Amino acid sequence: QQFGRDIADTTDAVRDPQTLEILDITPCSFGGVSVITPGTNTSNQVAVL
Amino acid sequence: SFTRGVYYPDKVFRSSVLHSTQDLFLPFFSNVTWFH
């Protein structure tokens, strides 16, 4: 085997050449950005989730 | 033939998953011509 696949059609692991070892590939982090705001009247200070 | 003639379809590695593929395979329990 040269590379591994998940239950879905996505690659989960690979056989790294130059060392013949197994490397797990994780989709690098991503996410939505939400803004906690009490309201323009209450305060302009906001938090980022 | 019983349950023989199955080969790895590719160099893809799969762990604890069921995979369905359509390739040239020997049918299960098929008649196989045997010679001495």
Swiss-Prot record, chain B:
The chain holds residues 31 to 66 of 1273 of the full protein. Attaches the virion to the cell membrane by interacting with host receptor, initiating the infection. The major receptor is host ACE2. When S2/S2' has been cleaved, binding to the receptor triggers direct fusion at the cell membrane. When S2/S2' has not been cleaved, binding to the receptor results in internalization of the virus by endocytosis using host TFRC and GRM2 and leading to fusion of the virion membrane with the host endosomal membrane. Alternatively, may use NRP1/NRP2 and integrin as entry receptors. Glycans are attached at N31. Binds to host ACE2. RBD also interacts with the N-linked glycan on 'Asn-90' of ACE2. Cleavage of S generates a polybasic C-terminal sequence on S1 that binds to host Neuropilin-1 (NRP1) and Neuropilin-2 (NRP2) receptors. Interacts with host integrin alpha-5/beta-1 (ITGA5:ITGB1) and with ACE2 in complex with integrin alpha-5/beta-1 (ITGA5:ITGB1). May interact via cytoplasmic c-terminus with M protein. May interact (via N-terminus) with host bilirubin and biliverdin, thereby preventing antibody binding to the SARS-CoV-2 spike NTD via an allosteric mechanism. The gene is S. This is Spike protein S1.
